[PDB]
């Protein structure tokens, strides 16, 4: 064991180290504080401890763990709240009587006091086994298995002992593998380092559609299962409704919410709001909490859980994606991780970079976005999995030209910006073609257009009218309404209702939170049909104010058809949107004559 020579701030120096490394985590002091050896100077190694140094005496023993900081992979991840450092937050409420552990909290990462239902998979005695194969399953979902028991990576052999169906503990072993002699005993919990990526057979292109729960987001530029999305904006852009809509209205088998720099109130509101919401796929009691995994942090929490929150969430998302289920990762935000890396770079005494941020934010940000994505699941079964990483960003320097927003936005393939002018009107998010871009919308429109889509023309026409609405509003604001024609006024009138109804996606009730493709395609088709009918009635003889004031509640009923849940019509297309086309077609004939 080493001896602590000096402790100044969040960094501690311990001499007599012969087992220290650059990414290995160890425990310093008698309280078992969470820390890791970042660098070494001669015979002593400098260890940066994210925990509070108030109450740690100089001269205590330091024992290195001999491996990097990782998390436990097994049954018990869903329905439990933990931190980014792989610590149990549920045990702190019983033992310490607090939400977060302030200091001196030595608890296990995996729960070993509860029993789970262990059932056998598609393997038996005498069959070959490999790393990533489905060795078992646990009933922890609505109608399917959630926590699938898989073997560790970089291992193989034959299953000598297979446990039967029943309840067992995490500390008890029910699996035995024989490969070149007695290899080791297998249990429910497994170890995996968070500083190394999860193994896989091969990576594939993302070609599956994903529901984000937003009419303007899915209508403007929808994402795929396995893509990277960046969301800039000062003071957020509606990450609560977008995060809850991605878990509730999302079509993924697993949902992972990770908070690296949250205050704690939004994570408690989103965590408590998950048990009240019912699953729409024939779920059970606590359906959203059983298939959701939450990693809660604090503003004054440890830097090891904040920086390791994206690594543990990406490792848990890769472990859930390795079994064959679709996982969605909602991270908020990367600016707290970049500021935590800049605080570690400034406190450690390393050379800084431009814009006050460290030089490892580009490689760590590119490795964090590169660690997620869609690919083939590792193992003998060869299942299909996907990991959608959605990380929002904020302006740390006060502008959109910083290295944090440009570094995360440059490596990402999908973008969803936020306009301050549209955000000031109580509409979040607000971007049509100036802050939003996506390359998978062409392949993503093939399936939604394959079912019953009209979004392929209405998305380009709505993006063209939304992009031309700012250019018409600039000349209309600068010069006035005297140098513009009636077509630009009708296009600005349709862009005002399309921006008011499409940009507003906050929701004032339970029916204003889900946004299907049929409702957005019907509203965009009705707005495009009203915009084409206004141009045809203006070309056949008519006025713009007589067309908009002549329409009135015909467009007001289409704008007001977002405060009810879809339970009428065929499956999701109510008759109010179907009769709006006949009412607009009947009003278009009377508007001409």
């Amino acid at each position: 064991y080493g001896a602590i020579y000096s402790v100044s701030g969040p960094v501690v120096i311990a001499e007599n180290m012969i087992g220290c490394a650059m990414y290995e985590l160890v425990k310093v002091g008698h309280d078992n504080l969470v820390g890791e050896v970042i660098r070494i100077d001669g015979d002593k190694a400098t260890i940066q401890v994210y925990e509070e140094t108030a109450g740690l005496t100089v001269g205590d023993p330091v024992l290195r763990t001999g491996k990097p900081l990782s998390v436990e992979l097994g049954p018990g991840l869903m329905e439990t709240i933990y931190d980014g450092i792989q610590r149990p937050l549920k045990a702190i409420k019983e033992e310490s009587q607090s939400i977060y552990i302030p200091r001196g909290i030595d608890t296990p990462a995996l729960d070993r006091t509860i029993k789970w239902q262990f059932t056998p998979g598609k393997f038996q005695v005498g069959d070959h086994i490999s790393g990533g194969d489905i060795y078992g399953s646990v009933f922890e979902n609505s109608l399917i298995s959630s926590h699938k028991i898989l073997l560790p990576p970089r291992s193989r052999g034959t299953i000598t002992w297979i446990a039967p169906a029943g309840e067992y503990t995490l500390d008890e072993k029910i699996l035995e593998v024989e490969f070149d002699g007695k290899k080791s005993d297998f249990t429910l919990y497994h170890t995996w380092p968070v500083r190394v990526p999860r193994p896989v057979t091969e990576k594939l292109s993302a070609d599956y559609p994903l529901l984000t729960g937003q009419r303007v987001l899915d209508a403007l530029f929808p994402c795929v299962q396995g893509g990277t999305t960046c969301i800039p904006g000062a003071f957020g852009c509606g990450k609560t409704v977008i995060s809850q809509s991605l878990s509730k209205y999302s079509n993924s088998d697993a949902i992972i919410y990770v908070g690296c720099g949250e205050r704690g109130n939004e994570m408690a509101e989103v965590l408590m709001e998950f048990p009240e919401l019912y699953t729409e796929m024939s779920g059970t009691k606590e359906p959203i909490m059983k298939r959701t995994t939450l990693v809660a942090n604090t503003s004054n929490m440890p830097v090891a859980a904040r920086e390791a929150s994206i690594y543990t969430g990406i490792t848990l998302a890769e472990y859930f994606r390795d079994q064959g289920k679709n996982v969605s990762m909602i991270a908020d935000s990367s600016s707290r991780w970049a500021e935590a890396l800049r605080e570690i770079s400034g406190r450690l005494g390393e050379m800084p970079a431009d814009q006050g941020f460290p030089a490892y934010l580009g490689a760590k940000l590119a490795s964090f976005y590169e660690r997620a994505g869609k690919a083939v699941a590792l193992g003998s079964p060869d299942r299909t999995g996907s990991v959608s990483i959605v990380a929002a960003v904020s302006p740390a320097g006060g502008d959109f030209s910083d290295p944090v927003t440009t570094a995360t936005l440059g490596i990402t393939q999908v973008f969803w910006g936020l306009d301050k002018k549209l955000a000031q009107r109580k509409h979040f998010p607000s971007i049509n073609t100036s802050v939003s871009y996506s390359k998978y919308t062409n392949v993503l429109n093939k399936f939604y257009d394959s079912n019953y889509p009209e979004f392929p023309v209405l998305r380009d026409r709505m993006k063209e009218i939304l992009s031309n609405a700012e250019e018409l509003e600039q000349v209309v604001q600068l010069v006035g309404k005297s140098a513009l024609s009636d077509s630009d006024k009708i296009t600005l009138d349709v862009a005002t209702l399309i921006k008011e109804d499409f940009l507003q996606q906050n929701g004032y009730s339970t029916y204003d939170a889900f946004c299907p493709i049929w409702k957005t395609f019907d509203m965009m088709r009705a707005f495009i049909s009203y915009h084409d009918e206004a141009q045809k009635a203006v070309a056949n003889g008519a006025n713009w104010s007589k067309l908009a004031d002549s329409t009135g509640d015909v467009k007001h009923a289409v704008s007001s058809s977002k405060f009810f849940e879809p339970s009428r019509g065929e499956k999701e297309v109510h008759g109010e949107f179907e009769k709006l086309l006949s009412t607009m077609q009947e009003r278009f004939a009377e508007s001409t004559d």
Partner: protein
């Protein structure tokens, strides 16, 4: 040992590293002055400590060392309410001692009472513009963003004076279930503003239930920076220990950030953007972390700090990190205060984090969030229509911009127009906003439900 060197407010001493981190050290000099401080850095045969008493006049080979044996912690007790104290934790009246019974660390919370349920209890303060446009909850941190030449101390004194009288009528409404307490923290403020806030605290009746910290620009920045952690530790210890709602007002954030920037250039830490320190997220994260519900379901810690701009720009790291880290913000406009509006609370960039989950049943209505969102969108569209009507003209504009232009003019001098001692409930703000909101048709109003919009325009 002796002082090896001194650079600014931090002095490098040759003491051993046998003592723990944050332990108090006493320097004895032959000039007749004793200075106490905490060890900021520990090493082998060397240490760096920041003293809170005295700035210059530290001898090199004439200083002595003393081991106190106690960590740097502010003693919080129930007898501190009713006396004037300093920022370092010393009374200026020369009265009794602090008499602290519990130990609370200033660097991070020592309990970590993160509430797992979001607050839904609306706390009133006597302002229809603040509480109506921004939904307040039990423990929601909402800062006030001001600039150079704006009366933020008058709005903080009006919020402190108005906060304490609505608690008796709000106690029967199920908005509050505990007593109300105030937290007074002053750093870099004038004596006339501290006496003006003391007159509002004595007039409101919170002088015998709150602690005052007097910090000026003539003392050290290390002693002034310890006042917000002691005030937040006393407010969190009283709110968690007593189960009462405590509102803490800490002004100004620029004076506390100036001590961190002045204690960042002499150290080995690399500075950030705009000449500020690169570790401002860790210092601001400790004050921002102490906010929300407490353990027991009966107490909370609310923070209403006043942040003034040091350069009058919207690209600073203090306003961007403080506005993004908080759950809301209160914008102040120079045109509203210069025009004659009181209080000058801007509703254009003003937005709250909780608007659909902070109002409950018994003390607030359900249409307050839709009326606040419709008033915010009508205020922004009325501001853009007022700018287009001021630039191009009302004749060149359409007929839709005239209703928002008249609604912004009527709501600018009707909604945000109030006295300095008059109170307004949240229920009267919806009925008063419903009369001003009835200037447009039902088709143009789309920020509310059709039942509440059809039942009341």
């Amino acid at each position: 040992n002796t002082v090896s060197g001194v650079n600014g407010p931090l002095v490098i001493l040759e003491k051993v590293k046998f003592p723990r981190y944050n332990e108090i050290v006493n320097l004895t000099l032959p000039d007749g002055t004793v200075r106490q401080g905490q060890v900021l850095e520990i090493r082998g045969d060397r240490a760096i400590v920041q003293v809170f008493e005295g700035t210059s006049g530290i001898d090199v080979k004439k200083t002595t060392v003393e081991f106190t044996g106690e960590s740097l912690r502010i003693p919080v007790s129930e007898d501190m309410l009713g006396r004037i104290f300093d920022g370092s934790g010393r009374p200026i009246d020369n009265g009794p001692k602090v008499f602290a019974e519990d130990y609370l660390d200033i660097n991070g919370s020592p309990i970590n009472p993160y509430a797992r349920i979001y607050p839904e209890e609306m706390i009133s303060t006597g302002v229809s513009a603040i509480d109506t446009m921004n939904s307040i909850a039990r423990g929601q941190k909402i800062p006030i963003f001001s600039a150079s030449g704006l009366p933020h101390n008058e709005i903080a004194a009006q919020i402190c004076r108005q906060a304490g009288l609505v608690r008796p009528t709000k106690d029967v409404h199920d908005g509050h279930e505990e007593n109300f307490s105030i937290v007074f923290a002053a750093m870099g403020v004038n004596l006339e503003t501290a006496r003006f806030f003391k007159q509002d605290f004595e007039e409101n009746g919170s002088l015998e239930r709150t602690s005052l910290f007097l910090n000026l620009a003539n003392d050290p920045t290390i002693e002034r920076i310890i006042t917000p952690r002691l005030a937040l530790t006393t407010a969190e210890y009283l709110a968690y220990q007593t189960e009462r709602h405590v509102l803490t007002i800490l002004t100004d954030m620029s004076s506390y950030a100036d001590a961190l920037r002045e204690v960042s250039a002499a150290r080995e830490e690399v500075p950030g953007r705009r000449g500020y320190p690169g570790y401002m997220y860790t210092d601001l994260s400790t004050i921002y972390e102490r906010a929300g519900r407490v353990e027991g379901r009966n107490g909370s810690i609310t923070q209403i700090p006043i942040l003034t701009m040091p350069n009058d720009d919207i690209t600073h790291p203090i306003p961007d990190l403080t506005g993004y880290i908080t759950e809301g913000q209160i914008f102040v406009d120079r045109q509203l205060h210069n025009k004659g509006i009181y209080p000058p609370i801007n509703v254009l960039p003003s937005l709250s984090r909780l608007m659909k989950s902070a109002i409950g049943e018994g003390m607030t209505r359900k249409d307050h969030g839709d009326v606040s969102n419709q008033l915010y969108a009508k205020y922004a569209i009325g501001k853009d229509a007022a700018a287009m009507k001021a630039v191009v003209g009302e004749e060149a504009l359409s007929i839709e911009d005239k209703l928002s232009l008249e609604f912004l003019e009527k709501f600018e001098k009707t909604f945000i127009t109030q006295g300095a001692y008059e109170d307004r409930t949240v229920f009267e703000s919806l009925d008063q906003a419903w009369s001003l909101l009835r200037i447009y048709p039902k088709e143009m109003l789309n920020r509310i439900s059709p039942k509440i919009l059809d039942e009341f325009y």
